[PDB]
Design brief:
Chain lengths: 726, 160, 292
């Protein structure tokens, strides 16, 4: 039985005195403000509902939340203690405390929380009582907690805040160039009460030893750890069932003689899990139960969906992923925070994963600047066949080499690894040379708790000039994990997040100068007035491609989104076209975590920029594309599947209508195939790529010539090409 | 109330490598100058006491915990250098955005450079690109040029 | 008051590499012999109790904490050897400069060397250059030569003996040439012997089997024995007999087979490793430690 403590709570907040409040008495004696609160939630959401703060998504309202970083937060509610039978255990489960808090049950402290990113379970069996009980949580200022530490030289001056270095919180919450500064606080995930039996399952760890797709066989290991009273030894059995849609695959029963056991399961009639393109994402319900031999009473049951696959990181960013023995070409996006108030992440996960399914990503890199996503995110990636590269939660900086930080990081790593090691989508852990953190603490955790996945102790930003400069086109990285280009968001998003007088970007009507609110949406971390900076990437990249920056807002949106769309499509066509040497491209990024101006290709409110649709047409399983060649161009077809296909391709000049090429092609599986050389066209213009495979039509294009182009002429070529809207 | 340093050694079990060296076995488990137990160039005089100053210091809630000056680069021909300041402070949150750091490089009262910046967080890196500054050299290889580096935490309103 | 060893294992969360090995998962986080939980050559009999001697000891303020004998060099032809004594004591400061260390190397009552030194610090290294002494060899390559080594702390005024430590040591050097080869006294030796397993599932009866079980190795003409990591550490008498009968000892630590990489297990193992090493590092029969 699980009993949700989510719902309406009482939240009292006040400035933190020099001595932090930590007791129930001190919290009730402090001068503060009391409002109703929702759990899971963030304190700013409750405050906005109480009319105490203004919408931080709009204008410069993010800076008005600054004073609350030095506040404390006192959650309170009462609950009904469940009935407990002799030997049973009552556990208070916290999915997320943000962050430094003292937890009390009936005036008795039961725990001191100190990590935003992991669960916190407290055995409260002996401190509860009949009738109404009392739960009180007293949070301290996360920012002020940093001054309890002395920083090393390496932890000062990085892009990540010095306040983040000694604490275990998501680094992006202190502000980033793609995330607002919104430290926040609160119980941002579920709070539940759980009753456990003296016979219970501690952990069920499913490991794929081998898979044989052609014979439809696989060897799965179950590493089972349990709590078992000794007079229950030789009197309880495990019931292991693997099923798919109800149809059973395996039933194995074993007498429980010791508390931990390795059960090897050799299965037949099982399909292998594959990433998108390379096969189906076959999943199987794995269920383990502890059952009394005599009465048949079930003491515990653990159920999940597992997948049978093998992963090997084959080094030569000079590496390629080997899935089930086949070398896969990765194409996907980096995953950034879904919301600055992370209690709303769960409400965004399903639609955000749908962005990747429609994009046809086969991989996603969960950026270490974000929290660790919850189980549902990985369940969706298992279901839709999206490989997951998981960073440990550390942004862009250096960290302490001392013991106290290593102990906190070790505890976090053990928690998250044991939590996620059973998802087939997860394929890699990353630490993000003498560093103790990335070469000892994390590697020792992967060594003991997940020897099945590779651990990694590439990033193409740089000058961010013309996307055809040799910085990009001659970078020798086989596998890139970060690469992006700026694009102004859609007008409807601009009008929603800016004040009416600030929708038009030009300060004093001077093209190229940004008003103060656009500067805030850079993002700008602190309210410090200046001109230029990150926003100038938009105008600089527009000026390179189109000669001049349009003054009209609609013309500027189209020009900016066209440069982002052309650049990102070019990077993906450049890596797909140079296989087998190129092994993967993880681009940045697919979705904003806050209404901002960014290099993402779709904004926080779901507004897709032109890059999303361009990218979608170069992300197909089998994609015809054109790459520049010595003299002229080259028509290629790239196949990211294990199947051969045949089709017909036609290339025409959009302006004149002249046919450039027409013929048939065979696309051999999992490789790039060169179709035909294309002769050099004169001047500037656009080629349209039409091809048909299995009675389905597909469309691509190639922009030839050299910049600068004329914006209205490029807009004419897009409309006459007939593929994308304007 | 000070105890016997010599008798403290017997609270530890020594490893083989810590026995038989010219350093005394009494010195192996303690953090004291090894020569105090005796050397070929120093007498044995274990001694004890408060051998350096004892003071009382009054600090404000806003205070400089550490000022770490680092030379990134130096160009003696151009009389230039790039000096970083790694500054750590104690800063009550109410003092955030209300205090500024005032950084001064000077030589015999003549101000070489002044930089001011608002304290928005407790720890910061400030990089100073200096002109008209000579490098520091050991004897024979040049002059031992020194410069007064000062940092203060000043209230932006009251000037405190 | 002893509690259940099996139930203690459920106070630890195990890593994957500690689940599914031949040794029991109950054995992974606890410092016991893995064979007590069962093996292919040993029954499952966990047992409990005070399985070795319980004694009450009275020590003087001046006492010997450890006498560590180390063979620096040996010359079997010239019948010479250099032996080092790493001596650690408890010494009240009033007894500084008032106690002396008396060291006697003898054999069958015949004194080989006697050395006296005033105790001016609690820990000292004494180097002894002995003449007229033979080297210790394993069976076949020579005689298992042993000499009685005695160290006493004596009041320099009254002659009162505050403590005395006595053992039989052997002068020998051991080197491993690295798929390796043992080098005793500069000579490569061929190893031939047995693996020592538990002498009894109820280990309190081990001490009564030692004499007859070592005789078996003597009649076999073993020159080496490897104590298996699944067993307990043998007591002093086993190594004394291996000294007397010239049987080299390969000592496994009590591992079974992968264990925790975390701090708690590492502190418990270092505590055990230091205790066992200090206890056995003076026996000439011991030639090699192994992680097993």
């Amino acid at each position: 039985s699980e009993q949700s403590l989510n719902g309406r709570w009482t939240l009292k907040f006040f400035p933190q005195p020099a001595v932090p409040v930590m007791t129930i008495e001190g919290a009730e004696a402090a001068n503060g403000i009391v409002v109703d609160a929702v759990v899971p939630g963030n304190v700013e959401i409750d405050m906005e509902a109480a009319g105490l703060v203004e919408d931080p998504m709009v204008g410069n309202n993010i800076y008005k939340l600054r004073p609350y970083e030095g506040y404390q937060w006192y959650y309170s509610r009462t609950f009904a203690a469940p009935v407990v039978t002799e030997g049973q255990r009552l556990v208070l489960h916290f999915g997320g405390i943000d962050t430094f808090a003292e937890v009390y049950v009936n005036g008795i402290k039961v725990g001191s929380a100190d990590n935003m990113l992991i669960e916190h379970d407290y055995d409260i069996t002996s401190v509860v009582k009949e009738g109404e009980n009392r739960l009180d949580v007293i949070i301290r200022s996360s920012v002020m907690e940093a001054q309890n530490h002395f920083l090393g030289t390496l932890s000062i001056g990085n892009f990540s805040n010095e306040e983040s270095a000694p604490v275990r919180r998501a680094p992006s919450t202190y502000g980033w160039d793609i995330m607002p500064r919104l430290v926040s606080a609160g119980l941002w995930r579920d709070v539940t009460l759980r009753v456990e039996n003296p016979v219970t399952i501690v952990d069920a760890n499913w490991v794929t030893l081998s898979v044989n797709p052609k014979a439809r066989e696989a060897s799965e290991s179950l590493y089972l750890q349990t709590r078992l009273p000794f007079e229950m030894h030789d009197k309880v059995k495990a019931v292991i069932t693997i099923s798919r849609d109800g149809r059973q695959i395996l039933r194995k029963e074993a007498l429980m003689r010791k508390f931990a056991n390795l059960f090897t399961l050799n299965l037949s009639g099982v399909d292998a899990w594959w990433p998108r393109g390379y096969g189906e994402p076959a999943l199987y319900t794995a269920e383990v139960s502890l059952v009394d031999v005599t009465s048949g009473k079930i003491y515990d049951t653990k159920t999940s969906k597992i997948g049978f696959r093998t992963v090997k990181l084959e080094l030569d960013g000079q590496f390629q992923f080997i899935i089930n023995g086949e070398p896969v070409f990765a194409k996907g996006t980096n995953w950034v925070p879904l919301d600055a108030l992370h209690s709303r992440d769960a409400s965004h996960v399903e639609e955000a994963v749908q962005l990747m399914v429609e994009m046809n990503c086969n991989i996603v890199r969960c950026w270490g600047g974000n929290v660790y996503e919850d189980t549902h995110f990985f369940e969706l990636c298992d279901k839709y066949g999206i490989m997951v590269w998981q960073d440990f939660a550390m942004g862009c900086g250096n960290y302490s080499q001392r013991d106290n930080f290593a102990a906190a990081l070790e505890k976090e790593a053990i928690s998250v690894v044991v939590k996620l090691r059973n998802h087939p989508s997860l394929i890699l852990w990353s630490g993000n040379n003498n560093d103790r953190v990335s070469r000892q603490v994390l590697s020792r955790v992967i060594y003991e708790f997940d020897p099945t996945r590779p651990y990694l102790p590439n990033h193409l930003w740089g000058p961010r000039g013309y996307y055809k400069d040799p910085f990009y086109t001659e970078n020798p990285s086989q596998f890139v994990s970060e690469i992006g280009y700026h694009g102004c968001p859609n007008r409807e998003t601009l009008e929603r997040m800016f004040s009416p007088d600030s929708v038009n970007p030009w300060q004093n009507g001077v093209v190229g100068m940004w008003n103060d609110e656009w500067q805030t949406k850079a993002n700008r971390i602190y309210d410090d007035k200046f001109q230029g900076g990150r926003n100038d990437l938009m105008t600089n990249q527009v000026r390179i491609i189109f000669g001049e920056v349009p003054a009209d807002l609609d013309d500027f949106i189209f020009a900016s989104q066209s440069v982002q769309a052309e650049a990102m499509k070019f990077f993906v066509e450049l890596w797909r076209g140079r296989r087998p040497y190129r092994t993967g491209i993880i681009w940045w990024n697919i979705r904003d975590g806050w209404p901002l101006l960014s290099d993402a290709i779709s904004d926080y409110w779901g507004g897709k920029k032109q890059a999303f649709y361009y990218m979608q047409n170069v992300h197909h399983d089998v994609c015809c594309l054109i790459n520049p060649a010595a003299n002229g161009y080259m028509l290629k077809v790239d196949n990211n599947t294990l199947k051969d296909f045949e089709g017909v391709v036609e290339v025409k000049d959009v302006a004149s209508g002249k046919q450039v090429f027409k013929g048939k092609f065979v696309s051999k599986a999992n490789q790039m195939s060169e179709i035909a050389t294309l002769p050099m066209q004169k001047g500037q213009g656009m080629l349209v790529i039409s091809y048909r495979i299995e009675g389905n039509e597909y469309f691509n294009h190639y922009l030839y010539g050299e910049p600068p182009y004329k914006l209205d002429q490029y807009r004419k070529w897009v409309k006459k090409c007939g593929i994308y809207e304007l």
